[PDB]
Amino acid sequence: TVQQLEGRWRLVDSKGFDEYMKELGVGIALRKMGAMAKPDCIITCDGKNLTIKTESTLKTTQFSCTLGEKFEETTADGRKTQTVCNFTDGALVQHQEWDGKESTITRKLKDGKLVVECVMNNVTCTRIYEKVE
């Protein structure tokens, strides 16, 4: 089930991500950092607490997301979000709530790559991450 999404997952593609970091609320130096750093997303499960480490070549953030429940996330930029995390047989939706504003992060398995299709409301990013094993 969720162990199809586990491992070190290394960033290659990020189409839509300039427009999505603009619509989130990300400053221009943080937008340059997030695009140039090239993140490795490391997923590993205890049961409901799913450990997600973002290793980028510039900044870093690590969190255990409670699967079928909300938690307080702190973003790599600075914003803090009330985040409900749900796996629907293939797709992990991380639903990020702050100040009446949602960001929806759909991490799903396509051809042995973790394809992260995010949407704020209208504005999207499609990020392709490859398995390091």
Curated annotation (Swiss-Prot):
Pfam families: Lipocalin (PF00061)
Binding site for (9Z,12Z)-octadecadienoate: 127-129
Chain sites annotated for binding N-eicosanoyl ethanolamine: 41, 107, 129
Motif Nuclear localization signal: chain residues: 22-32
PANTHER family in the cross-refs: FATTY ACID BINDING PROTEIN
Purpose of the protein: Intracellular carrier for long-chain fatty acids and related active lipids, such as endocannabinoids, that regulate the metabolism and actions of the ligands they bind. In addition to the cytosolic transport, selectively delivers specific fatty acids from the cytosol to the nucleus, wherein they activate nuclear receptors. Delivers retinoic acid to the nuclear receptor peroxisome proliferator-activated receptor delta; which promotes proliferation and survival. May also serve as a synaptic carrier of endocannabinoid at central synapses and thus controls retrograde endocannabinoid signaling.
Name the UniProt record assigns to this protein: Fatty acid-binding protein 5
